[PDB]
């Protein structure tokens, strides 16, 4: 029945995200969405009574990697937006991986697993952009990037965190399926138009 399957079927909402990320030469960000898409699909597949018998890894692993993979997707989608140079790129990519790994391990169901990375990624972005505004004496990301990427990207970001942390109280079938859709849009929108380090 559909009300058990929809949290698994809606986990294909990240398939637009990986197909767009690869098309834009963002091949690292493409890995993290594809990895997340697989582990989120399996995390819900093993949860759903209609199909839980299929799956081949224990629940302990899938729960950790669906949560870690999600929080790391939110991180690399934001460090793609920051668009740092070297060796700050590899450095700030690695800061996300190590911090989100340890934090997701310590308590994975604590909302802090998402809030820490988003808070730190927003601070790292705000430090770069306020330096770059002071350098140019003007609004640094063009008013197009604010009105087309950041604005809509964080608008779906606010919707995604509200659907997961608040409206889960009302439902887990449709609300959690709409959360997958909302979060896939944040990853598509917060990516730049091209990877400037590859094309």
């Amino acid at each position: 029945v559909a009300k058990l399957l929809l949290p698994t079927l809606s986990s294909l909402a990240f398939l637009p995200t990986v197909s767009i990320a690869t098309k834009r030469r963002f091949y690292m960000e493409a890995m993290v969405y594809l990895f997340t898409m697989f582990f989120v699909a399996f995390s819900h597949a093993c949860d759903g009574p209609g199909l839980s018998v299929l799956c081949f890894m224990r629940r302990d692993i899938l729960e950790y990697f669906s949560i870690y993979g999600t929080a790391l997707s939110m991180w690399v989608s934001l460090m793609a937006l920051a668009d740092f140079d070297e060796p700050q790129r590899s450095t700030f990519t690695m800061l996300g991986v190590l911090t989100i790994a340890v934090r997701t391990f310590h308590d994975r169901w604590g909302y802090g697993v998402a809030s820490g990375p988003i808070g730190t990624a927003t601070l790292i972005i705000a430090v770069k952009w306020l330096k770059k505004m002071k350098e140019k004496k003007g609004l640094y990301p063009d008013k197009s990037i604010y009105t087309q990427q950041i604005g809509p990207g964080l608008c779906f970001g606010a919707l995604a965190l509200m659907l997961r942390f608040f409206f889960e109280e009302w439902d887990y079938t449709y609300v959690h399926s709409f959360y997958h859709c909302a979060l896939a849009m944040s990853f598509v929108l917060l990516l730049p138009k091209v990877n400037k380090k590859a094309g």
Partner: antibody
Framework: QVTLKESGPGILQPSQTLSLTCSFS??????????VSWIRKPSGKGLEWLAH???????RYNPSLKSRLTISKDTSSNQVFLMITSIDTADTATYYC????????????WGQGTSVTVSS | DIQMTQSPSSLSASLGGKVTITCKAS??????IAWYQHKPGKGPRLLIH???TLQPGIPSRFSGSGSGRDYSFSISNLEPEDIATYYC?????????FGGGTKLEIK
């Protein structure tokens, strides 16, 4: 409306310092993030940037000419002044002032421009 | 500074035709190009900024594109009112430089 107006001597002798005035209207350079740029076009050449002055009273000059460029403002009389030293035949030009914003950094309104030439 | 180059120094084009005034920067300038129309004996107008964004009040015939040291300004169905000199402005630095400028003319 937004409007600008250049003014200057028009004609003068070589090896002399001149003051060019730009009066601004519809806005004030007192506004946070607001700036004015001075650009010149030598007779039979492409456009060439000269100088900047800003809300914070920071300044900037074209580094090849920086040795004889000096810019200043009076927001009380809604004006910017660009002074060129040691004027020569290369300064036979039309001089423009252009208002730059905080949101679009490329200058969005120009004045009509004024002619400058050196002769005896 | 950064030297800027426009490919046609002058461009003869038919009334109601199309043009593609093409521009190369000396180095990467992060899409901070703006395109100006210098109508003869008058103050220039800003048409396009950040490579592609049109200024409000501009007909949709003018359109810019390109990224990374090569940008393209284009007029569609060009009117007799479009016969003017067209300059790009590099504005990634506060050390601005203009292109040599294209004297577009009627064929």
């Amino acid at each position: 409306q937004v409007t600008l107006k250049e003014s200057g001597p028009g004609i003068l002798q070589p090896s002399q310092t001149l003051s060019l005035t730009c009066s601004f209207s519809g806005f004030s350079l007192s506004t946070s993030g607001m700036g004015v740029s001075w650009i010149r076009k030598p007779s039979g050449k492409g456009l060439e940037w000269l100088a900047h002055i800003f809300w914070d009273d920071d300044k900037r000059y074209n580094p090849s000419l920086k040795s004889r460029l000096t810019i200043s403002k009076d927001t009380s009389s809604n004006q910017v002044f660009l002074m060129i030293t040691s004027i020569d035949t290369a300064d036979t030009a039309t001089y423009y002032c252009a208002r730059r914003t905080w949101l679009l950094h490329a200058m969005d309104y120009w004045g009509q421009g004024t002619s400058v030439t050196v002769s005896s | 500074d950064i030297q800027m180059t426009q490919s046609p120094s002058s461009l003869s084009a038919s009334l109601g035709g199309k043009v593609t005034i093409t521009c190369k920067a000396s180095q990467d300038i992060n899409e901070y190009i703006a395109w100006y129309q210098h109508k003869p004996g008058k103050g220039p107008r800003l048409l396009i900024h950040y490579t592609s964004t049109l200024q409000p009040g501009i007909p949709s015939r003018f359109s810019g594109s390109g990224s990374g040291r090569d940008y393209s300004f284009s007029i569609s169905n060009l009117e007799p009112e479009d016969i003017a000199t067209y300059y790009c402005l590099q504005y990634d630095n506060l050390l601005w430089t203009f292109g040599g400028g294209t004297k577009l003319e009627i064929k």
